[PDB]
RNA sequence: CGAGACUCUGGCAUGCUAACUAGUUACGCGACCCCCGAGCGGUCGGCGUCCCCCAACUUCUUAGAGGGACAAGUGGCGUUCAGCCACCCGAGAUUGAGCAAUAACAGGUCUGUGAUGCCCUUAGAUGUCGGGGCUGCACGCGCGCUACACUGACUGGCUCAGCGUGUGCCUACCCUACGCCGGCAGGCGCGGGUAACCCGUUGAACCCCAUUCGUGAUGGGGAUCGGGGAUUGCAAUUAUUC
């Protein structure tokens, strides 16, 4: 299968937990006081979300022929409040997205390949499929 | 269904259940929503709870981290006054002491007779933006 | 090689081309089952022809669909039109007329315009207003 | 004063009256009686053969 | 317009009241429970989440914005 | 040897472009070169928006002029000079025709 | 499914029209049963077209009003589906039967149209078309649900459910009923 | 003569002719290969990259020639006419622009015009550089924008686009994939692309979803002010902006 066949929300959560088991995610010295994106009016609830984002990024790269920071930033991006001016699209934090790409690479979930940026590793392809199976049995919604 | 823990003090205001902890704290000056949220994360306290929940212990742990921000890795950029004008540091200013400094700076630039000072004193708009048909009704 | 017809569905902008080829698989839309996708608050609508006319008919053929253009609702309407049309198209040249005709009867009566095109595409904006037919407030003494 | 509720069914939409043209004359077969057939004005859009629930034939509804 | 607040402390009496008023309900949402008691709406919600591990209430929606509970199977 | 040659044609005028394209295709094959056939590229609509009114009082009246540039290419494969030679002759005004050494 | 086309978790069966004058603008199975309401998103294409649209679809459409909530059908479909569930817990039954009863009880009989009479405030007692009675009923009920929700804890789904049940068998806590009694009373009076 | 007619655009052509700065199909499909499922497995189906043909196509994409709408067919009505109504097919006699007569106006413009009459000024400029104001607010008006919330504020997550545009330009110059650093602003190294090649498979926002908050001026709202960092310019003071 592709990852798209199974439940997308459950996929990212299952993969995120699998990442926690691995015991490393090469975590930043930020993400405990951060602004994060400029689409945020309140600082992050927890420092947990880094795993979830990593899973999400891994899935997104699996779909594509290879991609880097730009792709992740638009997906996580949303509407930016400009105060008393019209709300408009923007792209938020790039340090976190870059860090996530580096960290996944370190574990060898994704690796540099042709068409620029990171594309999936066969190690990652195997990991994603195992959690895909667990998700597939669970539901389809 | 736990009452029991209630009536907490942060600085000069009584903090009780009303909103999530973070928001509850922002009665005082110098603590915005973002500030109180990040102090709680540092202090290892679940911020989704009420301020009629949690004991006196947790409150003191919050107070120490807010008033020694650098020494608990709340960075310098996050501070209301960076490098300041009175003090060569980087200080988080809280409660009544913010009001003091605001007064100080306005008086300061009336002496020095800087444009910001003069405009504010006279009641003219300090920013150069239109006040043509605005800044009243 | 395997026998195959192609058809399309058209709502607003969002073409949906269905390639209806000999074999057994799902109806897949962008490689994933109809059940998934999201918004899944409209979900029963795109299930509807399949349920009405049995799943045995749409499992005698593998149907894979590529959708681009428009937005989420635009696409839903387009896909539904292409899948029903697909089935009929395949039976019309290869299997038999009575099957395709039976499907056309069942659909056309309650009706949903799944074998005839929708005319409606965006109307041009003309100057002197903020909208297409909306116009700026006037002021009068 | 009081009369029983009469169901009466639209036989023929006569045309439109009203100053602004927003009152439609209608002739309603009295339904209970085929002998009676009386003109009542309907405010809404009228499609023939739909049924009015007349609470009166008093205070006759007529052109304006 | 309006000014209306509810108790924003999680209390003793209102939890007990809830569980012992249970035949009244067949429809339970946060808002209903909040109105009928003085519990918040937020802490209406949470009391239900606790209550569901008696299983005097059964989930029949699980939507993000607000949830809908039944009392028992159907009442 | 055969050499891959790209003939780009750019213009704005459909009918003129079209019958230049005709002549290149027909005369190409006539004394044997590759026929191919035109790859139509999307016509590009240059849009300029201006106020209709000098001195702006009255009503908001806007005028929008467009200019529609049309592009097409054709890839002929056959030998060196006799391609670009037989093609580019027999035309002078008003339709640009470019013969490019590009493509191997 | 082709035998009877149900709603998306409720039945279209056992829905009864309790009035003989409101027929053929109340339907849900007289051809017009749907799992999910949506025709083509035009309903203003013909004057004929209104008959096609059943009461359920009309109720979803009328709900999305007031600038922020305009043009969000998907939000309304989710709210409406939730609302049906709330009705079902509160009265058992079939929620669609409750809906039909509510429309019939909320719809006016006589109303008034303006007529000249000296320049004094008088009006002519007139009956109104059943199409108008259904249209006005649906309006009243949606506006009632939204009005309650605005400065109260309860959501649009809950308030809509409450509004339908109160109207279905009278309680005098439904906006639509209260408004209808004013319209019919005034009609009877006049010149 | 105006308008109609006409022209241009939007919709109906699996018919016509084409496409390696465009794609699709369709094998053979093998590999990266995951087993996710079936099959013991080879193999089959699968989001993408890669295998590519002396493959096939124009369906999506593109733009050329063609046809289709004429109230045509049928039925009522009407001077049985001009026309009207319904019905079928279906783009229905339901799209939107472009288009302006006869003639008026002391409408606006000498500050668009080395178009221009007369007048003023002209080496002592009203022909150029340095500096400030248009941005000053007790108040009146207009177009707007942001709001008054729960179809929302908040925290994660899902996910689909289109019209257009770009550097290497006759007085001044681009879009950025991709590596690294920084919460951010931003800084820094590459490479491609006058371009359906590259930016951009334009994977945008609304939308969808699991929570939190709970209708409380509340966290709705972001006014006003204070401190600091950077970006633009030789020059930002009277926040240029971020």
PDB file of N, CA, C and O in Angstrom, chain A residues 37-63:
ATOM      1  N   UNK A  37       5.670  29.339  15.306  1.00  0.00           N
ATOM      2  CA  UNK A  37       5.201  30.090  14.173  1.00  0.00           C
ATOM      3  C   UNK A  37       4.612  31.394  14.632  1.00  0.00           C
ATOM      4  O   UNK A  37       4.326  31.587  15.814  1.00  0.00           O
ATOM      5  N   UNK A  38       4.444  32.334  13.678  1.00  0.00           N
ATOM      6  CA  UNK A  38       3.881  33.639  13.926  1.00  0.00           C
ATOM      7  C   UNK A  38       2.394  33.606  13.656  1.00  0.00           C
ATOM      8  O   UNK A  38       1.725  34.636  13.708  1.00  0.00           O
ATOM      9  N   UNK A  39       1.833  32.378  13.505  1.00  0.00           N
ATOM     10  CA  UNK A  39       0.425  32.122  13.337  1.00  0.00           C
ATOM     11  C   UNK A  39      -0.154  31.781  14.688  1.00  0.00           C
ATOM     12  O   UNK A  39      -1.342  31.490  14.806  1.00  0.00           O
ATOM     13  N   UNK A  40       0.704  31.806  15.736  1.00  0.00           N
ATOM     14  CA  UNK A  40       0.386  31.397  17.078  1.00  0.00           C
ATOM     15  C   UNK A  40       0.235  32.657  17.880  1.00  0.00           C
ATOM     16  O   UNK A  40       0.950  33.630  17.640  1.00  0.00           O
ATOM     17  N   UNK A  41      -0.810  32.704  18.738  1.00  0.00           N
ATOM     18  CA  UNK A  41      -1.009  33.763  19.703  1.00  0.00           C
ATOM     19  C   UNK A  41      -0.733  33.271  21.102  1.00  0.00           C
ATOM     20  O   UNK A  41      -0.811  34.034  22.063  1.00  0.00           O
ATOM     21  N   UNK A  42      -0.353  31.983  21.255  1.00  0.00           N
ATOM     22  CA  UNK A  42      -0.054  31.429  22.547  1.00  0.00           C
ATOM     23  C   UNK A  42       1.033  30.430  22.327  1.00  0.00           C
ATOM     24  O   UNK A  42       1.037  29.709  21.330  1.00  0.00           O
ATOM     25  N   UNK A  43       1.975  30.345  23.295  1.00  0.00           N
ATOM     26  CA  UNK A  43       3.114  29.462  23.260  1.00  0.00           C
ATOM     27  C   UNK A  43       2.637  28.023  23.311  1.00  0.00           C
ATOM     28  O   UNK A  43       1.582  27.799  23.901  1.00  0.00           O
ATOM     29  N   UNK A  44       3.315  27.039  22.712  1.00  0.00           N
ATOM     30  CA  UNK A  44       2.900  25.638  22.673  1.00  0.00           C
ATOM     31  C   UNK A  44       2.472  25.055  23.995  1.00  0.00           C
ATOM     32  O   UNK A  44       3.063  25.423  25.007  1.00  0.00           O
ATOM     33  N   UNK A  45       1.450  24.165  24.011  1.00  0.00           N
ATOM     34  CA  UNK A  45       0.944  23.537  25.216  1.00  0.00           C
ATOM     35  C   UNK A  45       1.986  22.676  25.890  1.00  0.00           C
ATOM     36  O   UNK A  45       2.085  22.675  27.116  1.00  0.00           O
ATOM     37  N   UNK A  46       2.735  21.886  25.088  1.00  0.00           N
ATOM     38  CA  UNK A  46       3.712  20.952  25.592  1.00  0.00           C
ATOM     39  C   UNK A  46       4.886  21.004  24.662  1.00  0.00           C
ATOM     40  O   UNK A  46       4.929  21.805  23.732  1.00  0.00           O
ATOM     41  N   UNK A  47       5.887  20.141  24.943  1.00  0.00           N
ATOM     42  CA  UNK A  47       7.092  19.978  24.170  1.00  0.00           C
ATOM     43  C   UNK A  47       7.017  18.617  23.515  1.00  0.00           C
ATOM     44  O   UNK A  47       8.018  18.103  23.013  1.00  0.00           O
ATOM     45  N   UNK A  48       5.820  17.983  23.557  1.00  0.00           N
ATOM     46  CA  UNK A  48       5.548  16.657  23.050  1.00  0.00           C
ATOM     47  C   UNK A  48       5.473  16.648  21.551  1.00  0.00           C
ATOM     48  O   UNK A  48       6.011  15.733  20.927  1.00  0.00           O
ATOM     49  N   UNK A  49       4.870  17.721  20.963  1.00  0.00           N
ATOM     50  CA  UNK A  49       4.454  17.839  19.574  1.00  0.00           C
ATOM     51  C   UNK A  49       5.532  17.563  18.550  1.00  0.00           C
ATOM     52  O   UNK A  49       5.211  17.287  17.399  1.00  0.00           O
ATOM     53  N   UNK A  50       6.827  17.593  18.955  1.00  0.00           N
ATOM     54  CA  UNK A  50       7.985  17.434  18.111  1.00  0.00           C
ATOM     55  C   UNK A  50       7.993  16.067  17.458  1.00  0.00           C
ATOM     56  O   UNK A  50       8.304  15.951  16.274  1.00  0.00           O
ATOM     57  N   UNK A  51       7.585  15.014  18.218  1.00  0.00           N
ATOM     58  CA  UNK A  51       7.412  13.655  17.740  1.00  0.00           C
ATOM     59  C   UNK A  51       6.346  13.551  16.677  1.00  0.00           C
ATOM     60  O   UNK A  51       6.540  12.891  15.658  1.00  0.00           O
ATOM     61  N   UNK A  52       5.198  14.241  16.895  1.00  0.00           N
ATOM     62  CA  UNK A  52       4.031  14.228  16.036  1.00  0.00           C
ATOM     63  C   UNK A  52       4.355  14.837  14.697  1.00  0.00           C
ATOM     64  O   UNK A  52       3.980  14.310  13.653  1.00  0.00           O
ATOM     65  N   UNK A  53       5.115  15.959  14.726  1.00  0.00           N
ATOM     66  CA  UNK A  53       5.569  16.718  13.588  1.00  0.00           C
ATOM     67  C   UNK A  53       6.509  15.889  12.762  1.00  0.00           C
ATOM     68  O   UNK A  53       6.394  15.856  11.539  1.00  0.00           O
ATOM     69  N   UNK A  54       7.407  15.135  13.437  1.00  0.00           N
ATOM     70  CA  UNK A  54       8.406  14.287  12.832  1.00  0.00           C
ATOM     71  C   UNK A  54       7.745  13.187  12.042  1.00  0.00           C
ATOM     72  O   UNK A  54       8.102  12.956  10.889  1.00  0.00           O
ATOM     73  N   UNK A  55       6.695  12.556  12.625  1.00  0.00           N
ATOM     74  CA  UNK A  55       5.909  11.514  11.995  1.00  0.00           C
ATOM     75  C   UNK A  55       5.230  12.022  10.743  1.00  0.00           C
ATOM     76  O   UNK A  55       5.382  11.447   9.666  1.00  0.00           O
ATOM     77  N   UNK A  56       4.607  13.220  10.858  1.00  0.00           N
ATOM     78  CA  UNK A  56       3.917  13.942   9.813  1.00  0.00           C
ATOM     79  C   UNK A  56       4.827  14.232   8.649  1.00  0.00           C
ATOM     80  O   UNK A  56       4.460  14.010   7.498  1.00  0.00           O
ATOM     81  N   UNK A  57       6.064  14.713   8.941  1.00  0.00           N
ATOM     82  CA  UNK A  57       7.076  15.056   7.959  1.00  0.00           C
ATOM     83  C   UNK A  57       7.517  13.816   7.219  1.00  0.00           C
ATOM     84  O   UNK A  57       7.600  13.838   5.997  1.00  0.00           O
ATOM     85  N   UNK A  58       7.710  12.682   7.940  1.00  0.00           N
ATOM     86  CA  UNK A  58       8.107  11.404   7.382  1.00  0.00           C
ATOM     87  C   UNK A  58       7.107  10.907   6.369  1.00  0.00           C
ATOM     88  O   UNK A  58       7.484  10.466   5.286  1.00  0.00           O
ATOM     89  N   UNK A  59       5.795  11.021   6.706  1.00  0.00           N
ATOM     90  CA  UNK A  59       4.675  10.673   5.859  1.00  0.00           C
ATOM     91  C   UNK A  59       4.633  11.521   4.609  1.00  0.00           C
ATOM     92  O   UNK A  59       4.442  11.002   3.509  1.00  0.00           O
ATOM     93  N   UNK A  60       4.861  12.849   4.746  1.00  0.00           N
ATOM     94  CA  UNK A  60       4.793  13.816   3.669  1.00  0.00           C
ATOM     95  C   UNK A  60       5.869  13.571   2.642  1.00  0.00           C
ATOM     96  O   UNK A  60       5.633  13.705   1.445  1.00  0.00           O
ATOM     97  N   UNK A  61       7.103  13.283   3.117  1.00  0.00           N
ATOM     98  CA  UNK A  61       8.239  12.915   2.303  1.00  0.00           C
ATOM     99  C   UNK A  61       8.045  11.606   1.593  1.00  0.00           C
ATOM    100  O   UNK A  61       8.489  11.477   0.454  1.00  0.00           O
ATOM    101  N   UNK A  62       7.325  10.629   2.208  1.00  0.00           N
ATOM    102  CA  UNK A  62       7.065   9.328   1.622  1.00  0.00           C
ATOM    103  C   UNK A  62       6.275   9.498   0.335  1.00  0.00           C
ATOM    104  O   UNK A  62       6.605   8.887  -0.679  1.00  0.00           O
ATOM    105  N   UNK A  63       5.305  10.453   0.341  1.00  0.00           N
ATOM    106  CA  UNK A  63       4.466  10.781  -0.794  1.00  0.00           C
ATOM    107  C   UNK A  63       5.246  11.331  -1.964  1.00  0.00           C
ATOM    108  O   UNK A  63       4.974  10.990  -3.112  1.00  0.00           O
TER     109      UNK A  63
END
